[PDB]
Amino acid sequence: QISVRGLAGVENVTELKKNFNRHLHFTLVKDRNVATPRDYYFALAHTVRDHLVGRWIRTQQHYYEKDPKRIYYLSLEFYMGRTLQNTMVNLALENACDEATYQLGLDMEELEEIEEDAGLGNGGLGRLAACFLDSMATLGLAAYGYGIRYEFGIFNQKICGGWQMEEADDWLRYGNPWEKARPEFTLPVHFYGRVEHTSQGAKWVDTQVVLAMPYDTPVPGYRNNVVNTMRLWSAKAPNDFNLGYIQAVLDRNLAENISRVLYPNDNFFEGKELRLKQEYFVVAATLQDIIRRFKSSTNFDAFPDKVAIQLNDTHPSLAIPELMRVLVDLERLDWDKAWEVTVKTCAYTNHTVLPEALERWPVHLLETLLPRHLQIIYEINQRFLNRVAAAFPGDVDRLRRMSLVEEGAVKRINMAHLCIAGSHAVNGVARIHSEILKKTIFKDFYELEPHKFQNKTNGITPRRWLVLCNPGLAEIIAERIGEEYISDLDQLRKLLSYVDDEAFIRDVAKVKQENKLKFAAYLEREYKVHINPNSLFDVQVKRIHEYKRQLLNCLHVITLYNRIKKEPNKFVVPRTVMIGGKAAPGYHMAKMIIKLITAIGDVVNHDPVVGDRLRVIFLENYRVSLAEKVIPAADLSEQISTAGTEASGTGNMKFMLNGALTIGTMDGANVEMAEEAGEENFFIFGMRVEDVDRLDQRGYNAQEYYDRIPELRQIIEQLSSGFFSPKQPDLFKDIVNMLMHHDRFKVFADYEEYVKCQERVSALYKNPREWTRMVIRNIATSGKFSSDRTIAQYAREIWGVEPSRQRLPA
Amino acid sequence: QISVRGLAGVENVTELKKNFNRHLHFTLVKDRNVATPRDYYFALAHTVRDHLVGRWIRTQQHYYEKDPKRIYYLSLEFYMGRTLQNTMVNLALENACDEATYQLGLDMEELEEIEEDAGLGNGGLGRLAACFLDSMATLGLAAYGYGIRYEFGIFNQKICGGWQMEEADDWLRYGNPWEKARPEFTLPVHFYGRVEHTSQGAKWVDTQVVLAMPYDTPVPGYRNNVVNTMRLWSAKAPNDFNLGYIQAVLDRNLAENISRVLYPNDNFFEGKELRLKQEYFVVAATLQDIIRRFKSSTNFDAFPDKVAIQLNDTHPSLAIPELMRVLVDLERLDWDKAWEVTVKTCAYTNHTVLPEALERWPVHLLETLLPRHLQIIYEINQRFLNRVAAAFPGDVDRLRRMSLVEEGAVKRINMAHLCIAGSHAVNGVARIHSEILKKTIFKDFYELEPHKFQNKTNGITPRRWLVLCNPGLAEIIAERIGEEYISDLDQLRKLLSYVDDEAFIRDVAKVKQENKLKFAAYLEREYKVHINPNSLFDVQVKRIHEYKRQLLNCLHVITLYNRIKKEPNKFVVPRTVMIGGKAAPGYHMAKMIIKLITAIGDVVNHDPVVGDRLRVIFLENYRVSLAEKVIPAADLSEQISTAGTEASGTGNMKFMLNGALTIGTMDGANVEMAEEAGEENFFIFGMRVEDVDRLDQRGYNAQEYYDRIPELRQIIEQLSSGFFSPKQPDLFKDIVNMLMHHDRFKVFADYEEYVKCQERVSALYKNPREWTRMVIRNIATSGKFSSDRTIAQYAREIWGVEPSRQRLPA
Ligand SMILES: OC[C@H]1O[C@@H](c2nc(-c3ccc4ccccc4c3)n[nH]2)[C@H](O)[C@@H](O)[C@@H]1O
Ligand SMILES: OC[C@H]1O[C@@H](c2nc(-c3ccc4ccccc4c3)n[nH]2)[C@H](O)[C@@H](O)[C@@H]1O
Ligand SMILES: OC[C@H]1O[C@@H](c2nc(-c3ccc4ccccc4c3)n[nH]2)[C@H](O)[C@@H](O)[C@@H]1O
Ligand SMILES: OC[C@H]1O[C@@H](c2nc(-c3ccc4ccccc4c3)n[nH]2)[C@H](O)[C@@H](O)[C@@H]1O
Ligand SMILES: *Cc1c(COP(=O)(O)O)cnc(C)c1O
Ligand SMILES: *Cc1c(COP(=O)(O)O)cnc(C)c1O
């Protein structure tokens, strides 16, 4: 059908067909008379997977021979989503598989919908790791993603009576055809115990052992025959574990619980023992694998020339004292030499400045669980602070501020401080965020070691986030500028030459309308919800958080509703307002925000006077596969966090690439997006970081805004009085009370400017041709936000390796 | 190499080779440069498994079309052992696979040793189920084995300091290539709750749900292209289970523990809740599957014409009240009609008369866990006892004896009574055992319903237990009488014509010597133990139990030792005495017996005066794969249980078929073995059942034997005084005290006759030609003990179906 999907050659189609039938028979043990769509999905998955095998084996063989510097990306989260389509795209098999299945009487799109998301992350941080793996493979880097194979990923969200309910995501129930268990490379991980000091160094003894069993998933690069590995560890008890008899066998679950479930908090630290066990488990198993591979190339001076470890936030920070432990206690290196190796090997990426998100582990927990690591952390701290004292003599308050050990009611270790001390590079994830790091929370560290601090603005992979989810747009683009942009997204700038081309304008607008029709249809089928496909699709999808200000969106929606009720017969641009995202199960205010949104929908969607001029829809169970459907359908992207709070954002970039205009604050990467597209082509509003600081200095008083803005007062009165909850009039009191007396995110302060900016959005939507022209200017300047650009920068500026677009032989 | 192993055709060998290489690449994702023997085993297993698929699909298709009566064999235990060789044997692929692997530079025997036993049973009862499945497939019956897929089977036994230690049998660690998960046929099972009575019958409500997920294993018949199914259920929690958040997900293990571990007691009832859950779980899931398959053929009058359910002991006895529950509560049949259907569908096999082995469940447990089933059991009991009262008016003690409900400190349900009331047939497992049932524990039931009681003497499959484990013997037999005997074992009678044939005598003796050399070699390799291969191999392998009297064997061994010490320079026939078996982890006396055996070895094996005239070896970790090695090597089979205690025995039959002579009591199937071979060709000794009864009537006084037999007194003094435990002189006091004051199994009473009989064994071993002639007479008359004979009898006399030796088309 479409060119970017590759060729459907007769020989290939014929071979895919027979391999599909072979798997259906020999692998699934079914005949076509009792096979279900799920069986057909599996037969296709095994057929496609077979094409990865040769490339996977030859890629790993190649790294063994060439011995390049290896990149180890450590993360507690990898939000991969579905794998089938991505694999076809990267191997150029999509059209051929479409043809083969069609000849077999099957609709491939239908089979794709059967696959479960691999949801081993919470949101942005996890999904960034996934885009990064795709880019590292596409750029030919010898890169390995290491994490935990959670049995249960991020929970499935059900909405019941307008409230979030959670159910376990049993993603492995039907099997996972994309992983290969490797029980032969199982490794031991130690916990608890005690330290004993001998004539010959420290020894960690009397430990409990848990086994780490690896499962390997292939990561194909884009049409370059490179297939890298993501290795995820699963916890297993040893067979003599606890070894009356029956109870000892049942108690094996204590050990195996380490890999059972993903902690479901986004941007929030919960200091539980099980989480600490997960963090050490991934680090300890991974480092043994790293050292093994390094020895199979005795002198660790070359270690940093052959190994880079990138810490995705502080969650794998124990890699620093673990590497020291191994080098000092096991390999017998002197401390100073070991520390030199460690610093040159490790680099740290920070993804947040919110205080409640920073990891500060109680000393008593580390003391019990990881006694030798605590000793090492203390020694690191003493040596570090000796350097600080030498650099800033007499500055005693600096010593307390910079210490890895925090004093107080309960002593804690600040893991960010540990990572900075033990890494040769520290980066933020968007220019404004990296600046904020140097000016505020890490200022002291920047003054001691300015050379460590860098920026690496985030990106997204244009394979998944354009070619895969929006083939219509990819095609009309390729028609004008060829296919090269898929691995060189900066080529999209060539599209500026078409901003006055009538045919292109029409095609861009047509693709959006088709995407909107398709999404409107999906809504009716799977959720029996009707929507007007000619309305402006106004979408805010991301995790539910106070800092992301879904509440500000709600205030605008109610404003719109109230204005319609006031002048029913006045024309207003019709909108469908869609808000989706998951709340952490323990985050009460986030759960209340979900209920407010559905409550607003209950009123608005059933008021005859509104008609279909305004609809408010809560999109249930937002996840990667849903993002792939809704983002291509969106007209307006809401990126409205309080300035200074969203470190980068990446949903923002997905919307830009897919033909939505953005309404947003000057926060995170929004700043760079506006810079690339031009401020005239972006709907910017609200306080800047400097304005937020000014307000904090004089004191934020929400009452002032309530007193001066009658439309806002009306909304608050509606909320308090029970207008949106007739049977439970005080249902939203916690929300009102937060907004009026302890709003850390200054929702009222940006309300007036937000509403006025939304009016400018509506005015532009009334002129389709100029709306589309502005869309073309955004798509055309989205190239900087490819994760290929991001990864090339990490490679050259942190890891010391050169990317390559050269193909291995098939 | 050898004929019974089939043909090695060029086309087949070529195809096996390329499929082996294909699996190594695509399935295992390895190249030959990093592959290990384990990878090679897996590649071979997948290659062989592919040959099962077509036959498996076509067999099950065939049953769907023809709609024959289906046989459901319900068991909590299936002791399958290894699958690779058995599969090759039954598909005629052994020689071809041997040739293919040899051409690839691999030794197939080596690869076979990598496979784990599937050890989902304790011993005889579990292994009987496995032989039965093989026979049902070989006889073309539409038969299904249903059980539980335990994550951990029977524990691995390690001996440390002469004591048994247990370690978990993590048999699934590397995967199981022989099963197919079928998550699509998952079914709900209910627990707890309460009963509510409506206008329209009872309703079981407020239950907790556990899901039963099936895994299917193929069961190939011998060269007939039939492949039946063994379906084993695994426990899974529902996704809303327990649904703070993290704890709710971790608590899923409560539900999943149902299928975690096999209870490791042989012939001993332990009344624990988890065991009851396992029993209901298998029954409830299985019955839904049965009914489903029956409806997909509304009138249940035909149910017994289309379904037979065989209960392997009382462990699945809840099938009776569950079937009633489904028919009465769900399908709305009247009670009397439902009971008629149930009785005609169910049949019960009893495997023990030991009181401590009989299941008697506390009423309070059933009341809490299965409230509706308890109501039904009460109703069954009332109606049954009404029949008894009508038949035996005024006999009130009979009413209390026959009741399903036992009165006392704690009320219990007698599950054997339930099974008899609810089955149209009840059988024992050897003629003497079936007689014992009618004369003692089930006498009252036999008087009420004589027609229900039958015998079905046990058997073993001659595929695994001759062709597979003793190819040398199978071949020298086939040379004389052709290959037909492998599925018609009665043809072995033809061998009586060769009892005076000098060439045959020599060949039989040669095969035994080769087996003994091979086993002696295995001992040195894997256990660094040296043995004299010219000695008489005297073996007792079976679970460790007081009733099996390993202790009597020990007394003979010590007698032999003491006699040598007394007259060192007198010639005695050299023996290697091997004893193996597992003790239940909580069975203290059994663990003490293991320690006594190793203790005797420590003394005997290191006494220079004994030399290699006597060796005592404890065979560690006895299991099906070890049985396949040691049984072909044995000269003397010890089958020495107290008369009346071993219901049948099946190890006895394995030894007979493999060229060992038997020393044994007239117990279980030993009686029928002696009858078939002739008493002159069997070493029979000891009390008969009638003698044991006589002694019990006058009172067993062990002191009498001690007082009259000086050789016995000497042994007891040695045990008490610390001769076999220098550092812990009173280590064996529990044993001595049991033997002298509370021996339920009358070890001393059979001692004199046992020792004298062992002397006759030694005298015959001195004459190789006559030893071998007697061996030929045993092998030649072992035909009755094929499980094909047994299954043909169940089919004709209980299930109402005809066996068939006709081949399906390949
Ligand atoms: O090896 C992990 C899984 O191995 C499956 C298995 N997987 C593969 C396999 C084979 C090829 C593959 C190629 C790409 C990605 C994944 C791949 C996986 N071979 N065997 C078993 O079916 C499953 O129970 C087990 O957990
Ligand atoms: O850099 C990728 C993304 O990382 C998100 C992010 N996620 C987390 C996060 C994610 C999971 C966490 C779990 C425990 C403790 C803290 C945690 C913090 N921190 N930062 C940022 O909010 C977003 O702007 C960003 O684009
Ligand atoms: O389906 C059960 C197992 O399915 C394996 C699988 N097994 C088969 C299969 C395929 C053919 C078979 C033929 C005979 C016996 C067993 C057979 C099993 N196909 N897929 C997966 O690799 C494993 O993770 C999963 O538990
Ligand atoms: O019939 C097969 C075999 O069954 C054995 C047998 N095994 C059990 C057994 C096995 C497991 C049990 C678990 C719980 C409670 C009772 C249990 C009883 N009962 N009988 C007999 O001892 C043997 O002579 C016999 O040949
Ligand atoms: C991209 C993405 C995110 C990140 O969105 P932000 O708006 O940057 O927070 C979260 N969840 C999913 C499923 C995504 O695909
Ligand atoms: C046959 C067999 C048994 C049964 O032996 P008995 O001597 O009849 O108790 C027990 N265990 C294993 C492994 C077997 O193969």
Neighbours of A18 (CB within 10 A): 11
The answer to whether B294 is annotated as binding is yes
User: Cβ distance A550 to A544 under 8 Å?
Assistant: yes
B261 near A CB under 8 A: yes
Among B42, B87, B179, name the best residue to mutate to test ligand 3's pocket (greatest count of ligand atoms within 8 A of Cβ). B179
The CA distance from B808 to B54, in Å, is 12
Beta strands in B178-318 (DSSP E): 180-181, 187-191, 194-198, 201-205, 208-220, 227-236, 307-312
Q: What is the Å distance from ligand 1's center to B27 Cα?
A: 7
> For residue B756, which phi and psi values (nearest 5 degrees)?
-65, -40
CB contact under 8 A, A168 and B250: no
Kindly report the protein residue whose alpha carbon is nearest to atom 4 of ligand 3. Answer: B180
Q: What is the Å distance from ligand 5's center to A269 Cα?
A: 19
Nearest to A57 among B29, B54, B263 (CB): B29
Kindly report the protein residue whose alpha carbon is nearest to atom 20 of ligand 2. Answer: A351
Nearest alpha-carbon partner for A208 in A147, A266, A255: A255
The answer to whether B64 is annotated as binding is yes
CATH of domain B1-459+787-810: 3.40.50.2000
Q: Cα A318 to the chain's mean position, in Å? A: 22
Q: Where are the domains of chain A?
A: 1-459+787-810, 460-786
All residues of chain B having their beta carbon less than 8 Å from the beta carbon of residue A261 are 246, 249-250
**3-state class of B160 per DSSP?**
strand
Nearest alpha-carbon partner for A400 in A410, A414, A415: A414
**Quick one: tokens of B667?**
């117990």
Q: Tell the burial category of A172 from Cβ atoms under 10 Å away from its Cβ (0-12, 13-18, 19+).
A: middle
CA separation (Å) from B200 to B54, B196, B333? 48, 10, 12
**Quick one: tokens of B684?**
């029979």
Q: Is the dihedral of CA B713, B718, B724, B725 positive or negative?
A: positive
Does the C-beta of A265 come closer than 6 Å to ligand 2? yes
Query: What Rg, from alpha-carbon coordinates, does chain B have?
Result: 27
**3-state class of A152 per DSSP?**
strand
B166 near A CB under 8 A: yes
Q: Catalytic: which of A650, A662, A772, A790?
A: A650
The CA distance from A420 to A317, in Å, is 10
Separation in Å, CA of B123 to nearest CA in chain A: 18
| Side-chain-facing half-sphere of B630: CA atoms under 13 Å | 27
- Please list, in sequence order, all residues whose beta carbon lies within 8 angstroms of the beta carbon of residue B19, skipping any fewer than 6 positions away: B47, B50
Does the C-beta of B126 come closer than 6 Å to ligand 4? no
The CA distance from B732 to B591, in Å, is 11
Nearest to B261 among A169, A240, A249 (CB): A249
**Quick one: tokens of A32?**
């076509």
**Helical spans, DSSP H, in B709-807:** 710-721, 733-741, 751-765, 768-780, 787-794
The CA distance from A229 to A238, in Å, is 26
Separation in Å, CA of A245 to nearest CA in chain B: 7
Nearest alpha-carbon partner for A414 in A394, A449, A444, A451: A444
Q: Catalytic: which of B223, B325, B543, B789?
A: B543
Find the length of chain A: 810
B57 near A CB under 8 A: yes
User: Cβ distance A531 to A615 under 8 Å?
Assistant: yes
The CA-based dihedral angle spanning residues B664, B666, B669, B673, taken in that order and rounded to the nearest 10 degrees? 70
Among B624, B630, B653, B665, name the best residue to mutate to test ligand 6's pocket (greatest count of ligand atoms within 8 A of Cβ). B624
CA separation (Å) from B518 to B463, B490, B573, B631, B646? 21, 29, 21, 12, 31
CA separation (Å) from A156 to A232, A375, A581? 22, 41, 11
Nearest alpha-carbon partner for B516 in B490, B539, B482: B539
**3-state class of A451 per DSSP?**
helix
The CA distance from A769 to A766, in Å, is 9
Q: Tell me, in Å, the resolution of the deposited structure.
A: 1.8
- Number of helices and strands in chain B (H, E): 32, 25
Pick A460-786's CATH classification: 1.10.3720.10, 3.40.50.2000, 3.30.420.310, 3.40.50.300: 3.40.50.2000
| Catalytic annotation present for B542 | yes
Which residue in the block uniquely carries the two structure tokens 């759960």?
A591
Kindly report the protein residue whose alpha carbon is nearest to atom 26 of ligand 1. Answer: A181
Q: Quick one: closest CA in A to B259, which residue?
A: A250
Nearest alpha-carbon partner for B627 in B683, B578, B679: B578
**Quick one: tokens of A257?**
């619980």
Q: What is the Å distance from ligand 5's center to A383 Cα?
A: 40
Q: Is B1-459+787-810's fold the same as B460-786's?
A: yes
Instruction: Please note each residue after which chain B is broken, C-to-N distance over 2.5 A, or write none.
Output: 243, 297
- Please list, in sequence order, all residues whose beta carbon lies within 8 angstroms of the beta carbon of residue A545, skipping any fewer than 6 positions away: A266, A267, A590
Bridging pattern class, strands A180-181 and B683-684: unpaired
> For residue B234, which phi and psi values (nearest 5 degrees)?
-120, 140
Kindly report the protein residue whose alpha carbon is nearest to atom 18 of ligand 3. Answer: B180
Nearest alpha-carbon partner for A617 in A264, A81, A159, A169: A159
All residues of chain B having their beta carbon less than 8 Å from the beta carbon of residue A160 are none
- Residues of chain B numbered 15-34 and touching chain A (CB < 8 Å): 25-26, 29-31
**3-state class of A560 per DSSP?**
helix
Q: Is the dihedral of CA A295, A300, A306, A311 positive or negative?
A: positive
Which residue in the block uniquely carries the two structure tokens 């005859």?
A608
DSSP state of A767: S
Q: What is the Å distance from ligand 5's center to B110 Cα?
A: 53
Q: What are B158's strand-pairing partners?
A: B165
Relative orientation angle of helices A768-780 and A751-765, to the nearest 10 degrees: 110
- Number of helices and strands in chain A (H, E): 32, 25
All residues of chain B having their beta carbon less than 8 Å from the beta carbon of residue A168 are 239-241, 243, 249, 252
Amino acid at B539: V
All residues of chain B having their beta carbon less than 8 Å from the beta carbon of residue A263 are 246
**Helical spans, DSSP H, in A359-470:** 363-369, 371-391, 396-402, 415-421, 431-439, 443-448
User: Cβ distance A468 to A84 under 8 Å?
Assistant: no
Angle, alpha carbons A407-A411-A417 (nearest 5°): 75
CB contact under 8 A, B250 and A261: yes
| Shortest-distance atom of ligand 4 to CA B275 | 14
Q: Tell the burial category of A236 from Cβ atoms under 10 Å away from its Cβ (0-12, 13-18, 19+).
A: buried
The CA distance from A212 to A517, in Å, is 47
User: Cβ distance A227 to A56 under 8 Å?
Assistant: yes
Q: Cα A181 to the chain's mean position, in Å? A: 25
DSSP letters of B563-619?
HHHHSTTS----EEEEEE-PPPTT-HHHHHHHHHHHHHHHHHTT-TTTTTSEEEEEE
Q: What is the Å distance from ligand 3's center to B110 Cα?
A: 24
Long-range contacts of B393-400 (CB under 8 A, 24+ apart): B398/B444
**Helical spans, DSSP H, in B67-193:** 84-91, 94-103, 108-112, 124-138
- Please list, in sequence order, all residues whose beta carbon lies within 8 angstroms of the beta carbon of residue A337, skipping any fewer than 6 positions away: A300, A301, A327
- Residues of chain A numbered 170-229 and touching chain B (CB < 8 Å): 170, 173-175, 180-181, 183-184
Which residue in the block uniquely carries the two structure tokens 């009085």?
A721
Q: What is the Å distance from ligand 3's center to B216 Cα?
A: 9
The CA distance from A788 to A807, in Å, is 16
DSSP state of B358: S
Bridging pattern class, strands A180-181 and A208-220: antiparallel
Does the C-beta of B725 come closer than 6 Å to ligand 4? no
What burial letters (b/e) apply to A352-371, b meaning 16+ CB within 10 Å?
bbbeebbbbbbbebbeebbb
**3-state class of B93 per DSSP?**
coil
| Catalytic annotation present for A650 | yes
**Helical spans, DSSP H, in A67-107:** 84-91, 94-103
Long-range contacts of B679-686 (CB under 8 A, 24+ apart): B681/B774, B681/B777, B681/B778, B682/B778, B683/B757, B683/B760, B683/B761, B684/B757, B685/B750, B685/B753, B685/B754, B685/B756, B685/B757, B686/B640, B686/B643, B686/B749, B686/B750, B686/B753, B686/B754
The CA distance from B688 to B673, in Å, is 15
Separation in Å, CA of A226 to nearest CA in chain B: 16
| Catalytic annotation present for B543 | yes
| Shortest-distance atom of ligand 5 to CA A649 | 8
| Catalytic annotation present for B727 | no
CA separation (Å) from A115 to A118, A174, A277, A565? 9, 10, 31, 45
Among A180, A232, A233, name the best residue to mutate to test ligand 1's pocket (greatest count of ligand atoms within 8 A of Cβ). A180
User: Cβ distance A633 to A654 under 8 Å?
Assistant: no
Q: What are A683's strand-pairing partners?
A: A663
Kindly report the protein residue whose alpha carbon is nearest to atom 11 of ligand 4. Answer: B266
Nearest alpha-carbon partner for B703 in B756, B670, B740, B733: B740
The CA distance from B209 to B228, in Å, is 30
Angle, alpha carbons A37-A39-A45 (nearest 5°): 105
Q: Which ligand is nearest to the CA of B262?
A: 4
Q: What are B203's strand-pairing partners?
A: B196
The CA distance from A508 to B704, in Å, is 106
Nearest alpha-carbon partner for B75 in B196, B230, B224, B203: B230
**Quick one: tokens of A89?**
């795209």
Nearest alpha-carbon partner for A663 in A769, A762, A776: A762
Nearest alpha-carbon partner for B462 in B438, B504, B440, B491: B491
| Catalytic annotation present for B559 | no
Does the C-beta of B265 come closer than 6 Å to ligand 4? yes
Neighbours of B443 (CB within 10 A): 12
Bridging pattern class, strands B208-220 and B187-191: antiparallel
Which residue in the block uniquely carries the two structure tokens 């060789």?
B85
| Catalytic annotation present for A694 | no
Nearest alpha-carbon partner for A457 in A267, A668, A654, A316: A668
Which residues' Cβ are closer than 6 Å to ligand 1?
A 49, 52-53, 178-181, 218; B 27, 29, 175
Neighbours of A514 (CB within 10 A): 14
User: Cβ distance A307 to A345 under 8 Å?
Assistant: yes
Kindly report the protein residue whose alpha carbon is nearest to atom 14 of ligand 4. Answer: B269
The CA distance from B265 to B123, in Å, is 10
All residues of chain A having their beta carbon less than 8 Å from the beta carbon of residue B31 are 57, 61
Does the C-beta of B341 come closer than 6 Å to ligand 4? no
Q: Catalytic: which of B23, B548, B575, B789?
A: B548
User: Cβ distance B322 to B373 under 8 Å?
Assistant: yes
Q: What are A394's strand-pairing partners?
A: none
Neighbours of A703 (CB within 10 A): 11
The CA distance from B137 to B52, in Å, is 13
User: Cβ distance B229 to B144 under 8 Å?
Assistant: yes
Technique of determination:
X-ray
- A662 φ/ψ sector (left φ>0, alpha ψ -120 to 50, else beta): beta
Separation in Å, CA of B28 to nearest CA in chain A: 8
Q: Catalytic: which of A70, A545, A613, A654?
A: A654
- A162 φ/ψ sector (left φ>0, alpha ψ -120 to 50, else beta): left
Query: What Rg, from alpha-carbon coordinates, does chain A have?
Result: 27
CB contact under 8 A, A175 and B181: yes
